[PDB]
A paper describes a structure:
Flagella are helix-shaped hollow attachments formed predominantly by thousands of copies of the protein flagellin (also called FliC), anchored in the bacterial membrane by a hook (or joint) that is attached to the basal body and that is composed of rotary motor proteins. A [name] (also called [name]) oligomer forms the cap protein complex that is located at the tip of the flagellar filament. This complex controls the distal growth of the filament by regulating the assembly of FliC molecules, which are transported through the hollow filament from the cytoplasm to the tip of the flagellum. Flagellum-mediated motility is crucial for the virulence and pathogenicity of numerous bacteria, including Campylobacter jejuni, Salmonella, Escherichia coli, Vibrio cholera, and [name], as well as the major causative agent of gastric cancer Helicobacter pylori.
We improved initially weakly diffracting crystals of FliD78–405 by random matrix microseed screening, yielding crystals that diffracted to 2.2 Å resolution. Our crystal structure of FliD78–405 reveals that it consists of two discreet regions with distinct conformational properties, corresponding to a stable head region and a flexible and/or disordered leg region. Residues 80–101 form two β strands that belong to the first domain (Head 1), the second domain (Head 2) is formed in its entirety by the contiguous residues 104–230, and residues 231–273 then complete the first domain. Despite this, we were able to model the initial α helical structural element, corresponding to residues 274–308, of this region. This helix extends from the axis of the head region at a nearly perpendicular angle, resulting in an L-shaped monomer subunit structure. In the crystal, FliD78–405 monomer subunits are arranged in hexamers, resulting in a shape akin to a six-pointed star when viewed from the top of the [name] oligomer, which corresponds to the distal end of the growing flagellum. When viewed from the side, the [name] hexamer appears as a six-legged stool, the legs of which extend 55 Å below the bottom of the head region. The leg-to-leg stacking forms dodecamers, resulting from the helix–helix interaction of the residues 274–302 of stacked molecules and the interaction of residues 303–308 of one FliD78–405 molecule with Head 1 domain of a stacked molecule, burying a surface area of 1362 Å2. Second, despite vanishingly low sequence similarity, each domain within the head region exhibits high structural similarity to the corresponding domains of other flagellar proteins, including the hook-filament junction protein/FlgK and flagellin/FliC.
Author numbering:
A (entry chain A), B (entry chain B), C (entry chain B), D (entry chain B), E (entry chain B): 80 to 308
The structure:
Amino acid sequence: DILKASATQSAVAGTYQIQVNSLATSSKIALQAIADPANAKFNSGTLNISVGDTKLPAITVDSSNNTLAGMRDAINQAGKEAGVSATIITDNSGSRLVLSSTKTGDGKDIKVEVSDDGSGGNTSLSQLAFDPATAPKLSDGAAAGYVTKAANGEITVDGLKRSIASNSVSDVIDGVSFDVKAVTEAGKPITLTVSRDDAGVKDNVKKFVEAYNTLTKFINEQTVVTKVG
Amino acid sequence: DILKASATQSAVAGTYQIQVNSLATSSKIALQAIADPANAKFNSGTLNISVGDTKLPAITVDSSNNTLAGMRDAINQAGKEAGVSATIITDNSGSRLVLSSTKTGDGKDIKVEVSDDGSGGNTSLSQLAFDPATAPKLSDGAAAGYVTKAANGEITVDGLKRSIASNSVSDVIDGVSFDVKAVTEAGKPITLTVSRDDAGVKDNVKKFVEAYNTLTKFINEQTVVTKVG
Amino acid sequence: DILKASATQSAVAGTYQIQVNSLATSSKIALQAIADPANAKFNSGTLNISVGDTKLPAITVDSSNNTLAGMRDAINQAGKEAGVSATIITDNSGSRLVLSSTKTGDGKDIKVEVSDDGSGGNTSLSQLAFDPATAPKLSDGAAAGYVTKAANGEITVDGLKRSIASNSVSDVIDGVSFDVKAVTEAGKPITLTVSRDDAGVKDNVKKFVEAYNTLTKFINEQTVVTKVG
Amino acid sequence: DILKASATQSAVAGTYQIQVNSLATSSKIALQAIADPANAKFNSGTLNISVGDTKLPAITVDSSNNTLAGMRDAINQAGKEAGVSATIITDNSGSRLVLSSTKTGDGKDIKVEVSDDGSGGNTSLSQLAFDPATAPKLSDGAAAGYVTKAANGEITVDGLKRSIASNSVSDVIDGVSFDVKAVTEAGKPITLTVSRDDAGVKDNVKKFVEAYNTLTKFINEQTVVTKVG
Amino acid sequence: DILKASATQSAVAGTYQIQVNSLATSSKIALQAIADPANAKFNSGTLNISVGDTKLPAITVDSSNNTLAGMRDAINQAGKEAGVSATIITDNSGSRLVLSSTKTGDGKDIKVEVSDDGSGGNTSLSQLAFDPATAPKLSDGAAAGYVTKAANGEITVDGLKRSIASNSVSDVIDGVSFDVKAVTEAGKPITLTVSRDDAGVKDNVKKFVEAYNTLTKFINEQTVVTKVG
Ligand code: NA
Ligand code: NA
Ligand code: NA
Ligand code: NA
Ligand code: NA
Ligand code: NA
Ligand code: NA
Ligand code: NA
Ligand code: NA
């Protein structure tokens, strides 16, 4: 329904009390704001962006891309594989790059390491650096910060805790898959009913209801048909 | 349709021009009219009634049944086997016994043989005799006569004549049965078309497309079902 | 319509006055009637059945098939190739074999040649012979005869006669096929009109007005969609 | 209606009794039938086809087009201008070229002139010649003949005859055009009524009663609109 | 109905047997056909057109109007008063002027008098003259002739004949007007019934039963109305 939708493979019948304590989240960060973005040019250098283990192709910054829209274009094309996208948000501090990842789980935060040549433009390339270990939650101001931290969610099944790296999990209960969509209220768990029993093999009874009777009409009674003309 | 209704076992395709020249008929006769039937009682004796091959139980006429209605009741139960029934018809000549048979075909005429003791009542028992070899077609008057002659019918199939002993005939054309219901007009023959496979076998084949497809959901997709609360 | 249904490839515009004088027919014959078919068994020998060019497999008559129904079963499977089928018809003369062909045209008559060993049963095998060159049209009696003669049909197009070997003909008029279904009345010819472009090409052109216009919304107006909550 | 559909520019009122004695026709001819068209190839030469005034481009017959279908394709594109089309008709005499024109009127007959090199194939090119002055109406046989003669039609208006070169005529009655579609029965003339003003000008006048009245509300009553909240 | 539609002022009751033997007609003539009307220009002169009593303005033919269409335009505006209109009809003889009048009755024939200067163009002006006393009924050819003769119609009322100068007549029967629309069949007269009072005066009397009764509520019962809140 509104908290969890589930499905089954080949499992067993049963009932389960389930809580959702948190959802798995992905990473979304905001870099430092650039004053006067219409005339700002980044020094030449290299951008190394990673999300946990996974690394993006190193982005080389030159005069073909040392603008905000230039990095936006670069980042969006350097991250199509890993699911890292980018856009621009213009606030009272200036304009800034906003990067999002589609990867949920602990440790999948977006990191930006910067090699700055110290020359190439009017503003530093180093101010695009982002370290998930030190970065604060984003608040108003030109300073950088994360919007969401990548993290695991948590559910409980009949009292047993399960940290989840995605909101689509399988075999927490063997043969059962469900998509966790919202947190349950404190102490108010969902009852999950797995019925191995549908007496709807009476549907399969419709086979020999059809298979017999359908093959009594067009065969063995209407195989040869007559009428005047 | 209105002249002939047909049926099939398993035969072959083909077309046939059919004429119906006559129908098979059964026997129906009327015995002598009895003057003053309201006070008439028959002499003692025996009635032997037959229709062709078949003979009816010998009927003994005594003082428990020597009336017209008495003979009617006897014959009705002396003839349940062969399909001989009886009734009384009251005309300007009196009342008389009217006997019917359900056997169609040549020679299946109803015959009545009478041995009369010559005493037992006021009317002769002998005047209930009926010989189909001599009896005329019934006309007005006290005299006896047949109403219908038992006879074979006749059809032609593509020019070939078939005498039929019943209006329900089979295997005149191999594997085909039809009930002849009426005569065709002179020179206006019926076309009879025997069709084997149309939509064959694809009409009944649409079953096992479903019976198959139906065993995708309620089996192997609804074998185990989930629900939340 | 009811006399002729027509079709087109790609041809030219034009109008044609058409008469149908006759239809193409296939062969259908009836062999000699066999007296007392219920106890009749055929002498040993061979049946060679042909329809024009095409010859059927030589049929060997032995003690496994030397009955009428035995010949019926053989022919039905000895003739699946050429479209020769067989049945039995029971008339006042007895039972006889009735053979049909599906090949329309002149000379496609069914022929039966018989070599009779002169022994093997109670009836001659030779009386199943049929020579279309000598055989009369079937009439009542035990004698053999044809029911329909295989023959070409005839049509006229604007006065020009075309003999047709089938009632499904093509390219009598270039690019036009029609299935002739019935004869036209004497002096009442059908008008046949071949129309190339009406609403051309503007009927199907209304598609690419939409396919174009349809690719305004869901593409380039619904490429990116917004929503609030 | 079914005989004549009419139209008007701006004319005068009046009534007219109209007969249609004949329609304007176009030319349609059939050339000689070619025996064994499946292996027939034409001698070298030239085809000059004309319909009255109009002449078609001279057609050169060579080894790229010296077949019946080859001439069909040429004529179809050698005649797009004048409305001359062509097809092939296969009768008991063989296959032949059938040519049609769309120009109605007297003298607009299709003519075919042939210069034959006398060599190039197996059939003469000269037998495709057609002279409308000598050609008979087409009948069965290999010989050539016309199917329809190009001719003017004829109508009468209040007794006065008008020869028409097309079935779409104009200003026979000043300001009136009608498309003649069928012949009137002998002595059963059509009444044609030309009506100028009915509901005139008051049918369309009901507009400017509204267009006026409509400019009372949404203008000068809804020019400035008020609302509360 | 379909033959006669009638109306009343205030008359008396009665029944009448009515025949319609003929309708009143107006004049419609056709002048001489002009050969080569496309280059024809009329000599100088004057046209005086009259219909019975009424005379039209004298038409002066000059170099601004000495064509057929020029005369058409003049007459159309030289005749708006009397109901004389004109058009051109193009037949096998050429083009000609066709003039119509709307005045029904005996002697209201259209007459054309011509004074020809004998010079001014290529065709005589005198050939546009028309004398109803000598003119034949129009037939095919360049010659002039009338299309319809102006004439009175005729009806009979209970045997009494009335010549009518228009198909809209009044007070033939006092207080009764009817528009005669068609002829009655020979010996099949129409019955005409003039009914004074049916439901009289009680149909309209049902008004002042209400107008009275209606002035019970909204007046003298709803004069003063009460309500609570
Ligand atoms: Na900040
Ligand atoms: Na009788
Ligand atoms: Na009798
Ligand atoms: Na025969
Ligand atoms: Na026979
Ligand atoms: Na000819
Ligand atoms: Na010919
Ligand atoms: Na005349
Ligand atoms: Na004339």
